[PDB]
User: Fold Transient receptor potential cation channel subfamily M member 2 from Homo sapiens.
Amino acid sequence: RLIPATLYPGRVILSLDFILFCLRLMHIFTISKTLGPKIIIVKRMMKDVFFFLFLLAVWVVSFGVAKQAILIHNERRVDWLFRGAVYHSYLTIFGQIPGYIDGFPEWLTVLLLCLYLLFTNILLLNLLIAMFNYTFQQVQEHTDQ
Amino acid sequence: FHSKLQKVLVEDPERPACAPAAPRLQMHHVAQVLRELLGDFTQPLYPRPRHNDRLRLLLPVPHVKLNVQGVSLRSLYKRSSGHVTFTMDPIRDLLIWAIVQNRRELAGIIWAQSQDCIAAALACSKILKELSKEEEDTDSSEEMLALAEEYEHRAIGVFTECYRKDEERAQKLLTRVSEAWGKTTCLQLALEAKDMKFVSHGGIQAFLTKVWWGQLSVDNGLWRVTLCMLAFPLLLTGLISFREKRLQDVGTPAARARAFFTAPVVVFHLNILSYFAFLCLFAYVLMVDFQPVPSWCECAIYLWLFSLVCEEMRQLFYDPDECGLMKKAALYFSDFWNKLDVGAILLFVAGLTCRLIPATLYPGRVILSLDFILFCLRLMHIFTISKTLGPKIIIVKRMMKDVFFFLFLLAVWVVSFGVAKQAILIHNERRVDWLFRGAVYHSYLTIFGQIPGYIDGFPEWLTVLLLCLYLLFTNILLLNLLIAMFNYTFQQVQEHTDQIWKFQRHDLIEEYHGRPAAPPPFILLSHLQLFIKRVVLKTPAKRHKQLKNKLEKNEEAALLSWEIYLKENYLQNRQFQQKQRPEQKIED
Amino acid sequence: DPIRDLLIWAIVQNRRELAGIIWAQSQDCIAAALACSKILKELSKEEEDTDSSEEMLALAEEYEHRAIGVFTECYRKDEERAQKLLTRV
Assistant:
């Protein structure tokens, strides 16, 4: 921030300090009786934060490489072909699907879009629901005390 | 068991097979039927060969001079042999006879005076389980299975008493061979009996975390060992927690890495990131390198396919029977992941033959993208490892056919909307294989969000109605009751899928231990290293790098005297714990 | 602390039946039970590798539940004096 030729790296390296301190904000927010005893379940999950991320986001890559291949996509720039190949793959998860661009291979553009969302939305959501709530039932008396 | 021994005397009858005579049951026969009930292990408890070939003694076969299918060292041929003194397992001979007759109360007394206690209980868990599956159709196959898990829990409590006092000698008790039982080391003898409960107990799972994580420790973190994997000079630093550094035995920093690279953790790691980056190498030659020629970065994949399918050639020549070439390969045919290995090879022959033919690059562009994800099933196949991953990737093993279930439910139920959408509105977008877009492909997109609301929207009130009504039967019933279907079945067989993953955990380590530390770019040299050896050698007598720890004689009695003392300490506890149960006291 | 001197000697020798009798005649009852919960827990982690480190840990939670029931009987009658019993030296 004091060195004048590096304000663009000074703009990108300190925005993570805003959220690294937000972990420290939630750190002193282990207080309330509905919060404290069940923010210890995320203390049952802090390394497991790194687990399902490295599961599902690498499993995102199992779609994100699989998407651009059959269609002939042509949008490329220096560090925006990575947009038109890789960054537009996480957006087609929580909704930004360019259906006029993502849509002859229409039947298979049905198929894996059903098949991949089968292994995510069913297995990695709702069995992961089992993983929590059982372990929520498990050590609950501990995490109370 | 008698009807099986009323058969081997007649499958090997008096004239053609036991060629003088065999209506007299002799101890070679009961050895031959026991190797059927046990597995592919060694020559059985009683002498097969020409010294005591107890198959052909009713006809005058010659005495001492003969030594071929007759008597050699025993005294006189009096329609018998003599005193084959005790044959070194004289209590264990009563134990096997008491088990196969299902005498539950009798066999418990004989096991109390046993010598090799852990193996003799564990072997009887296999003989019972292989007999209960054979035949009664009821009521004693249940009882034999009930006796099997009874002897299993009987076998755990001897090891548990032994594991507590000085466990470094207790792991030596596990992996030792036993001459009394056809060598059959105790860990290997458990696994063919399939033995859910025995393998899951504690130090047995902790012993596998000491052969895997080979010479290093169990203490070092997984995120911290992988730094020194790529950074070779960071291995030499004061970061890693060895045992050679504990005894300060670093006299050679290559030997500090020679023990390190031969550990099963990083021969797993180096194989993974070779396989993690080969699909990256395959991702290179589909985007930019779409050429009809074998290019610069193309020829290695032919040498990459020669490298990995010849690891099955290492496994075919690994541990067979020395006559059955087609009877060992049925076990590879009994593995659907092995059929997912070569099934991802046959699709490459259906993909390479479209890559060399120049008029079919557009079908060569669409048929090999599924090989990227068919191998990703094989990528997740070797990723049944982590303790938060392994025991709960077995819940998707509770779901692999059920993958085909809810798909064929909901995606056909997608069609119940996808036909219902285009009908009332007058849609007009049609092409050759894009009217299927404007009628069918835009129906799965209106599920996870791409709703052309300016195109999907007078029938506005019913365009409300089924869009509420259909999403009612999906989002409520097929999502959140499907949530019930999982988590209950997650609660169900969980202890199994814990112990199943505990049981499955050994099968990764036997593959990754008995294999040299060469990376898959360098595994091709070791494919030839055993072939140049057989230009010099001629017999398979190289090495036995199995667990299989043979023991010296003065150490075996230094262990077996200790274990009998721990058996009688355990047996007095269960005899006391039976008296402390209150339902005994009402009987008292 | 002449009773408490017998209590510490009875605990470190793991004499479970003997140490229960000595604690009955103790004077500073809440602290003397609670202190023995620490001496046991720091000894069971030290060494036997089995079978009495389990028992010392079993005696520790036994004295813990033994310590709660004295405070619970004390907390019910006039708890404003019971909190004074907690934070005293």
About this structure: Residues 106-138 of chain A form the longest helix (33 residues).
